[PDB]
Amino acid sequence: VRLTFADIELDEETHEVWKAGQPVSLSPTEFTLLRYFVINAGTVLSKPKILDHVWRYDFGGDVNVVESYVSYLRRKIDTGEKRLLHTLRGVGYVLREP
DNA sequence: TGCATCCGTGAGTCGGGTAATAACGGCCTGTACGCGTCCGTTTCCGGCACCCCAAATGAACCGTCCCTGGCTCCAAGGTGAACTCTGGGCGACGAGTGTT
């Protein structure tokens, strides 16, 4: 009912996230993105998978919106020195301890 | 000297075939056929006098059609760097929109 990846903590009952204990506010899109990253910590997620799950299976919009959303996440979640969300060129994104 | 009295030519065109009587032995021969026998022919069994005839049994044998040897001198595989897209990554900006 309560998840924790390194410094980030997630509570699904209230759908909230704290970093280092500080509560970080997100859009619903960023929130569901973060839940989808934390549930499968360790493995690389590909962009088809992201739009396939995170977003509606019918979503046929441009991919770059998910890159921009991941950038939004990187603004305020990877602000610390310990880099969390690692980009793999041509592969996707992995939420993993460095 | 008429005169009847024959007497001699017509008259065209492209399914078959229908019969009688006393005749009877006996001899001759004649041409055709049917017998028994003998001789020219001819045709092969195996022999030479040898005719030799020959494909098969030793050579070379030399040119040549295959092996081995070395040699290149080059054009293809290996070693560079850039760049113009090619693709992803980053970021900001704006109204249609979840809500009391």
Entry resolution in angstroms?
Answer: 3.2
Q: How was this structure determined?
A: cryo-EM
| Ramachandran region, residue A47 (left: φ > 0; alpha: ψ -120 to 50; beta: rest) | alpha
- On strand B, nucleotides with any atom < 7 Å from a protein CB are 88-92
| A2 CB inside 7 Å of strand B | no
Question: How far: A71 CA to B22 C1' (Å)?
Answer: 165
Q: How far apart are the first and last CA of chain A?
A: 25
Question: How far: A73 CA to B22 C1' (Å)?
Answer: 167
Residue A10 CA, distance from chain mean position? 11
Record the tokens describing residue A81, joined without a space. 């020195």
Question: In sequence order, what are the residues at sequence separation of 6 or more whose Cβ sits closer than 8 angstroms to the Cβ of residue A45?
Answer: A36, A37, A92, A93, A94, A95
